[model samples]
Target chain A: NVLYQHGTLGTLMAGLLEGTATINELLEHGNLGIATLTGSDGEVIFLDGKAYHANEHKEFIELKGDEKVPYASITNFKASKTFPLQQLSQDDVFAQIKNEMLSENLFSAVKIYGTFKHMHVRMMPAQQPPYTRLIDSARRQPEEKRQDIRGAIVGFFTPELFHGVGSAGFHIHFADDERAYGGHVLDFEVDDVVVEIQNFETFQQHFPVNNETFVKAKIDYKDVAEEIREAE
Target chain B: NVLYQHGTLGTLMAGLLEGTATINELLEHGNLGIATLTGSDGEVIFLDGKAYHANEHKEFIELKGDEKVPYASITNFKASKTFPLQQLSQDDVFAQIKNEMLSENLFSAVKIYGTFKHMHVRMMPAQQPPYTRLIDSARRQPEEKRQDIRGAIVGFFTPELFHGVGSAGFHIHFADDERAYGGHVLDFEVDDVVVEIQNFETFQQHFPVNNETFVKAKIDYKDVAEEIREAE
Candidate 1:
């Protein structure tokens, strides 16, 4: 069983705590997932054994193992199920993904690869101590819109029981082959794609020992869980 | 009000989780406190503006900012109230620490400095993944007996509400002026020491972003919390 260090979505928001785990570290842990940088905030996608960073400005860059992150979820992705899909709206895709789930108690990592008619994403600047609540920070983040983009969406389906541990339900991060744009997934239209599902039952975690800021913060993550949901 | 990451003693034990935060990071965050190496571990002490490593062999060494610790707790030392004590046993010391405490609901950081007729400390080798429960690991730890030692005890007084985040109640890490001996403190005898108390209220945290093991770990930290109490 594995999960990121204190990686509950509720805790993440309430603590407004950030991390310094690297892209290379995520790659070493898992092959597919989504994440955000710690202070230099951005969205990340791990796909096909490679890592991509989509900053708040929608500037896509290839990370060569030096980038630092405060939040990210990754897995050595392997599909246990696959679905061929046609035109699907953002709501439509999530609704179907829930139906296709193998269980409600386990973590599900998924990949949707192909072409998209539309992609709506958002990113935020890096945040430090005296960090605003995550939802508040997220609410003020910038949105990037893209059309006729060919790429993939890497994300996870987390159980509500584990809400604060990481982003609950469907949390997606997107990246394109041209490395042009990416960020946290907001809304998207999938023209045609193959959806791959990998169910993670076993969990492992590695808490950071080097990050000083993370170690010292006091977190009463109970309320922020609701705030995160409201903001999301 | 900030303490070490996940600053709960019970959680640290239950997760069998390790961190990347180092003694230097802890030092940067707080000037005093105690903690141990994550795996293949040792005892650490930061007192009088210095960092000390007390090894399994009771060897004290000076550190130069390169050590990688998985778990540790540090705080800037300050005394809200000072207690002048007499020849006291380990049991007597804690009783006075409680009576001298400024508050009962908040976390307290205390420094017991001066002289000691005897000090009993322990250290362990580093631990790796698939870690034994914290208590189990702690139970097998090695102790070093020191007579007529002089130094200060860096430790915390946590309310029961925050036990799992770090060690609750009285948890101490020891290091001598010569940088010779230290570890999770179990028992000690001190005399004519001035106990400095610092009260903390606002707590913030920084969770690791690069630790893949942390993000992926599935923890059943409830039971281990008990093990921690017992081991302590």
Candidate 2:
């Protein structure tokens, strides 16, 4: 019955008899990075380490420290090209909603964690309100929305409450005990949404995104270095 | 702003990250058997030529036999005792789901394509009238109600599907055309419910497996050994 539980990478499946190698087996030689993704939008990997979660946010990642990872300047991201591996990767569903957010000013920033490529950005001003003028002018400045945090973000995607869901993110990432540590969980208004089966031979399921991200940053900018530099 | 798309690790995604070491990067240095669920649920990995889809149905596994690479069953999978570099590890979401479905079986099954597990019980059935009676005793056996195929599935867990969503199970594994005949993808479905996030700092936004995995025989067990299977 093939249910993916915590860390257990459980036993063998029924169809492995097929000749070709499977992905699970192939990853044995690779390194896992922390990946953060947006729902139905895009994805971002924590390129840097964590130090207030900001350090991990790569704003102006210099693929080599000189040329950025090629953000909006995505000249090419198709089927042909070499992609280097990272430490591990996780995901974020909130980024999808953030994508629809439109703002201006230093807040035009996204991925504020490291200020490199695929960094983290938030709507809540990390700066002081004196930037009100900044936050105001930038409220709806950017040609597009997003690049900001809306509603006190409790998790990376799941809202703080859904019909009373608290700390949405925690519920999805960690377990109950650990979830009590910080504030990652928030009850959901729905159930597993899908029923689990004993004989997992008939159902084919999909994965869902962790919705901790949101839109409505005081400012908006995809370029962290540029935004920070200009704010000065 | 950065948008992270955290879906499952099926061949579809492997194709998207074709080259950039995306699917590969998630599990660096990780050879056959290891998986980077760090991506999201439904995350499949192309381990040792074999492909594993973390879809709800066939989440956990270890492949073996004359057709596939023989693997020692995974005895333990505790929250990666090693966290992803600087990322924080949570047990809340992961543990809760684990406890709920805790039982010996986790993603263990053997199957043949095109056939549904529910209808596959062969051993020289009873006589004639009994056979008809047996087929008719299917009070809840709503074939039209559930989309299922039959096949010889012998794994730890009994996988099954429900609702309109073919939740999880023995899925069709195919290599991505973009991978120079290498990269692979496992196709699957998902639950009507899921978790959410707000930003991108989340490296481990694990969700609950409220849904079940469903599988249908897409390929023949015997043919797999002849084609995809390695020479014994």
lDDT of all predictions, in order shown?
A: 0.68, 0.19
Residue range B1-232, candidate 2, lDDT tens digits: 1111122222111111111123433333222222223212222334344434323332234222221110111111112111111111113322322333322122321111232212211111112211121222222121111113311111111122110011132222222222212101222121111211111111121111221110111111222212211111
Give per-model TM-scores. Answer: 0.52, 0.19
Give me the displacement of residue A94 in model 1, in angstroms. Answer: 12
Tens digits of lDDT, candidate 2, A172-219: 211111111111112212111111111111111111111111111112
Give stretches of model 2 more than 4 Å off: A1-47, A50-232, B1-105, B111-232
Give per-residue CA lDDT, model 1, range A131-188, as digits (tens). 7667767767888888878898988876543455556588888888787788888899
The Cα RMSD of model 1 versus the native structure comes to 11.6
Which is the leading candidate under DockQ? 1
State the DockQ, from 0 to 1, for candidate 2. 0.02
For candidate 1, the lDDT comes to: 0.68
Can you tell me the CAPRI class of model 1?
incorrect
In every candidate, what fraction of the native interface contacts is reproduced? 0.00, 0.00
Q: Which stretches of candidate 1 lie over 4 Å from their true place?
A: A1-232, B6-8, B15-19, B128-130
